[PDB]
């Protein structure tokens, strides 16, 4: 479905070029999508974030409110992924400052290892034939490359809750989502867990139209 | 190529997967006739991977098993060469924690082996009984159970004889033994036609060297006993002895399952066997009463429950034999600390009580009411409560009852959780002491009262509760000083301001007044109720619930130790309980409006209800309009109908709708005595069915519904005809509530007026140009048809016959 396999199960140039990456094929499809969408740098840094996320923001009990605040600062319209994008952007902007993350309630470990994974990604980028491009502030390309990677990882609104696009099994939004109260109609995620209730992490609001742009063979219109 | 084409046209499984139910009909029928030609050769390889595809859904599975079963019925022969494949790919489903995977694999394998070529099964699944893997042996064994479901044991039983008499492998003897136990699980009663054939099958392995086969065969004995209820050892005696000896000459897992089977046969047994067998096994039991092991404890205690619970275990036997070590080693803190042991120790100890009485068991668990792990004394009262509640307290002697009452008092004070445990324990224990409790009422109350004095709310509330429990026996032992006490002292505490205590106080006062009637209450209700009226303003759900309960009792029965003016003030206070957030309160309020209308006359309360109808915010209107209905029901409706009707003239909306809704409820409540006021009410409903608003016509329609169902059979059909004329035009409507009340009016009106009249109203618009009107008339005619489809046979029109059909019914116009 992602396009690494032919209809008989062998390797496309897509499949190999993604396979050289020591990172999941969904991510790999998104990185290839940066090629089409000319959002190279931004999709790169996003990948760098999802590599390690699980520990980004320190959330201490003894400084909950100032913490929620140095977090709520960056909260961008569009979703957690471009949130991470701006966060990294601002950190390196500060000159890879540790006190920066110390002031802004971010785990320096996560940030700097993510930077390293992006830099070696760039060191892979010549082989995977990617042109170093910026989206020029056009987050539409960004969300669309996110789709071209993570179309599978989607849910839609149901009046009985947020529910999958395919299996129509019932999910919920993580409390700490930058969209957690926004609650969008057409949803993309990155995790699929079921903690105390079914959950999904690193979620974003999408267009169902990009879905017929990208995967009319996997996502047909009548199902949206 | 024709084969790839046949699959191409065969994928109208899309016609069946997607589509209309028309699509389903076209494809289902065509394939159910094309099944032989299209064959399961190509089908099965298309078919298995979808039935195994991870997210084929409930009804996809349902439809595809529809397909497999009917195409296998069709192609009894034309499914032949794919048997082992279907078999092994579906096999894990019968042994599977999805009951419906078990069911659906079961059903399709039934039909598969059913229309199948027979020998095939045997041929494929002989060499797998000898196999090396217990995994595959269990899978094929429970398969064989399903295949016996599909065909029948008889055709197979000698091959079972083989797979169980094998001298090559113990693997295969174990396999046959579990095949045995598996059918014994599945078909259940269906075994008695054999009933010993399988016993023969199994006699070989309870003596066997492999503990696996030995002990699964013990469990086979268990399962066969289970499906083979009290009909005893006319079959099972053929193996009773290896069980008997291994029980002692064994240790461990065999002890477990072999004890399980023997205790499953201990019901089916008889005296000269169920005396020797039990009496023998009891000494095993006494050595196992100290067994640390959990499933040990389960099996041995279940055993004991049935075993020392027969008629051939003497009272004396148990009391001198089982009880001392049983009580010693299970009445340690460990068992109540345990999550399983609490309840199951209960089970068997209550049963031993059922066996041998209370004057020893009660005595053996008295002082466990004063142990440490509050869970423990909690358990002991759980038991005692169950016990005396089922049995009665006849034989409980003096000193026993003393230590019991005292451990009771302790448990209840010591209480440290908000639980009904100790409450119910107390209630039951005195409920059974009956009249035995006379001399400790100073003790019991003095305790409760000192608690009622405490600093923290919770214990105060508890003591109020406990009073509300023992309230009845408090009197029934003639507690002049003491029940008088509780009366006046609670009249004291009526001044609390912790809602949680005030509510319980009201509860306890109510539960005293229930036993002791009004005219000997210790505070005369002549001073009680005046004290209660300023509490009705306490804006809290629990105290409000209990207060309105108490005032409702009083206004029902007392009602004359109070003055009209008091009742009027209390009316004015009830008028704003109709906004509580809890519905029990509001229903209680309406009931007491009824009682007050009975005590005082109806007219003043009705005047105070109309003025409330003038309020906004509909919750109050709905309740008051209910209350008006209730007043009218008790004090006959002619007293209130003129005032309601006349109030239908005040030009405001909420009130005209209040009048209409109240008549709705009224005709519901009175019922068959509407044959009087139907005439009075019609010109008001026709008035409000000629428009005034949506809600106006919605409500007049509800009124028509209930009038019709009340006046069924009393001849007031001209009036309901007249109102049909006015209701039927609303048939084209859109608002859900409006059209819905209309449809309801037409079902009521259908029983009350008959189905001719309504089929005639529904005639002309069945075949109308439009589609909105066609659809409403077919909705109605559907509901007219479902109910009373059989009258209509004499109500259908005369519909002439054209050229190539016959349409007249000559049956009906034979002359005679």
């Amino acid at each position: 479905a992602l396009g690494a396999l032919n209809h008989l199960g062998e390797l496309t140039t897509s499949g190999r070029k993604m396979a050289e990456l020591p990172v999941d094929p969904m991510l790999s499809k998104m990185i290839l999508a940066s090629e089409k969408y000319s959002c190279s740098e931004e999709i790169l840094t996003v990948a760098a974030m999802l590599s390690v996320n699980n520990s980004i923001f320190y959330r201490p009990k003894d400084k909950v409110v100032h913490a929620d605040n140095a977090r709520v600062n960056f909260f961008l319209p569009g979703g957690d992924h471009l949130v991470l994008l701006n966060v990294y952007t601002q950190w390196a902007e500060s000159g890879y400052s540790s006190q920066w993350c110390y002031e802004n309630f971010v785990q320096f470990r996560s940030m700097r290892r993510a930077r390293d994974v992006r830099e070696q990604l760039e060191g892979l980028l010549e082989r995977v034939e990617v042109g170093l491009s910026s989206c020029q502030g056009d987050y539409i390309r960004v969300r669309k490359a996110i789709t071209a990677g993570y179309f599978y990882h989607t849910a839609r609104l149901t009046r009985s809750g947020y529910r999958t696009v395919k299996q129509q099994q019932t999910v919920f939004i993580h409390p700490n989502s930058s969209l957690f109260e926004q609650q969008p109609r057409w949803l993309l995620y990155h995790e699929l867990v079921l903690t105390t209730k079914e959950f999904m992490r690193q979620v974003l609001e999408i267009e169902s139209s990009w879905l017929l742009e990208v995967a009319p063979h996997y996502y047909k219109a009548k199902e949206l | 190529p024709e084969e790839q084409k046949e699959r191409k046209i065969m994928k109208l499984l899309l016609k069946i997967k997607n589509g209309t139910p028309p699509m389903r009909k076209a494809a289902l029928r065509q394939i159910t006739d094309k099944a032989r030609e299209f064959g399961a050769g190509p089908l099965f390889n298309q078919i298995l991977p979808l039935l195994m595809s991870p997210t084929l859904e409930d009804q996809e599975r349902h439809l595809l098993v529809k397909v497999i079963d009917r195409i296998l019925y069709k192609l009894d022969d034309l499914v032949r060469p794919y048997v082992h494949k279907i078999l092994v790919v579906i096999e894990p489903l019968l042994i599977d924690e999805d009951y419906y995977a078990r069911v659906e694999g079961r059903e399709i394998i039934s039909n598969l082996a059913k229309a199948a070529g027979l020998a095939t099964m045997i041929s494929t699944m002989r060499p797998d009984i000898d196999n090396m893997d217990e995994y595959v042996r269990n899978t094929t064994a429970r398969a064989f159970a399903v295949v016996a479901s599909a065909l029948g044991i008889p055709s197979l039983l000698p091959f079972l004889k083989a797979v169980c008499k094998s001298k090559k492998s113990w693997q295969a003897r174990h396999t046959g033994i579990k095949i045995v136990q598996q059918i014994a699980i599945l078909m259940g009663c269906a075994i008695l036609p054999h009933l010993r054939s399988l016993v023969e099958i199994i006699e070989h392995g309870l003596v066997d060297e492999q503990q696996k086969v030995r002990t699964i065969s013990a469990l086979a004995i268990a399962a066969l006993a289970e499906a083979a209820t009290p009909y005893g050892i006319e079959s099972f005696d053929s193996v009773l002895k290896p069980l008997w000896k291994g029980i002692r000459q064994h240790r461990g897992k065999g002890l477990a399952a072999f004890l399980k089977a023997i205790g499953y046969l201990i019901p089916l047994m008889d005296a000269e066997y169920a005396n020797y067998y039990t009496r023998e096994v009891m000494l095993i039991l006494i050595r196992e009463f100290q067994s640390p092991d959990e499933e040990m404890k389960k099996i041995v205690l279940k055993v004991v429950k049935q075993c020392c619970g027969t008629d051939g275990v003497e009272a004396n036997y148990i009391k001198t034999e089982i009880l001392p070590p049983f009580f010693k080693h299970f009445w340690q803190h460990r068992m109540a600390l345990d999550r399983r042991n609490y309840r199951q120790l209960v089970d068997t100890t209550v049963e031993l009580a059922n066996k041998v009485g209370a004057a020893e068991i009660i005595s053996r668990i008295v002082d466990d009411l004063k142990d440490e792990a509050e869970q423990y004394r909690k358990m002991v009262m759980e038991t005692i409560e169950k016990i005396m509640g089922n049995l009665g307290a006849a034989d409980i002697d003096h000193k026993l009852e003393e230590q019991l009452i005292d451990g009771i008092l302790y448990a209840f004070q010591e209480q440290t959780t908000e639980d009904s445990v100790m409450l119910n324990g107390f209630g039951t224990v005195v409920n059974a002491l009956g009249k035995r409790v006379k001399p400790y009422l100073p003790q019991i109350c003095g305790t409760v009262l000192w608690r009622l004095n405490n600093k923290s709310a919770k214990v105060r509330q508890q003591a109020a509760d406990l009073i509300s429990r023992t309230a009845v026996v408090m009197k029934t032992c003639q507690e002049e000083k003491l029940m008088g006490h509780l009366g006046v002292v609670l009249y004291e505490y009526l001044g609390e301001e912790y809602p949680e205590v005030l509510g319980s106080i009201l509860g306890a006062l109510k539960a005293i007044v229930n036993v002791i009637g009004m005219h000997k209450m210790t505070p005369p209700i002549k001073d009680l109720l005046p004290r209660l009226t300023p509490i009705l303003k306490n804006r809290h759900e629990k105290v409000q619930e209990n207060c309105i309960d108490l005032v409702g009792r009083i206004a029902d029965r007392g009602a004359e130790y109070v003055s009209a003016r008091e009742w009027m003030r209390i009316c004015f206070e009830l008028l704003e309980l109709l906004k509580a957030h809890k519905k029990a309160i509001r229903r209680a309020t309406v009931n007491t409006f009824g009682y007050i209308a009975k005590a005082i006359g109806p007219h003043d309360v009705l005047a105070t209800l109309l003025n409330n109808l003038k309020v906004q915010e509909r919750q109050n209107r709905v309740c008051t309009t209910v209350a008006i209905a209730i007043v009218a029901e008790t004090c006959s409706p002619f007293t209130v109908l003129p005032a309601l009707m006349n109030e239908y003239r005040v030009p405001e909306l909420n009130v005209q709708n209040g009048v209409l809704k109240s008549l709705s409820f009224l005709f519901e409540y009175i019922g068959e005595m509407g044959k009087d006021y139907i005439y009075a009410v019609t010109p008001l409903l026709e008035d409000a069915l000629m428009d005034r608003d949506l809600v106006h016509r919605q409500t007049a329609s509800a009124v028509v519904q209930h009038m019709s169902l009340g006046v069924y059979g009393f001849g007031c059909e001209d009036s309901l005809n007249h109102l049909l004329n006015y209701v039927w035009p609303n048939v084209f409507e859109t608002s859900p509530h409006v059209i819905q009340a209309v449809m309801g009016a037409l079902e009521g009106l259908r029983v009350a007026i008959g189905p001719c009249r309504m089929l005639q109203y529904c005639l002309q618009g069945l075949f109308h140009p439009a589609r909105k009107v066609r659809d409403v008339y077919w909705k109605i005619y559907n509901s007219i048809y479902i109910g009373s489809q059989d009258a209509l046979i004499a109500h259908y029109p005369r519909i002439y016959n054209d050229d190539k059909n016959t349409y007249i019914r000559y049956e009906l116009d034979y002359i005679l």
Partner: protein, 77 residues
């Protein structure tokens, strides 16, 4: 419209109902079958016909149940 899943389940539930497109043929044939099932059920119209023609109750109900198959002509088209 899940109401409709239930409602054409109702059409599947009660043989003889209708919908806004139903044809004179389905309508009148369903009423004709129902007429037959009740002539059989009610023990007395059976005597009426048995006596009207000179047949006997076995004869009567056999005719009726034969007729139950194509009572009102052949189908529509």
């Amino acid at each position: 419209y899940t109401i409709h899943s239930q409602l054409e389940h109702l059409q599947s539930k009660y043989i003889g109902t209708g919908h806004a497109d139903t044809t004179k043929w389905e309508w009148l044939v369903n009423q004709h079958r129902d007429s037959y099932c009740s002539y059989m059920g009610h023990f007395d119209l059976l005597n009426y016909f048995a006596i009207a023609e000179n047949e006997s109750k076995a004869r009567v109900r056999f005719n009726l149940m034969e007729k139950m198959l194509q009572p009102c002509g052949p189908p529509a088209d």
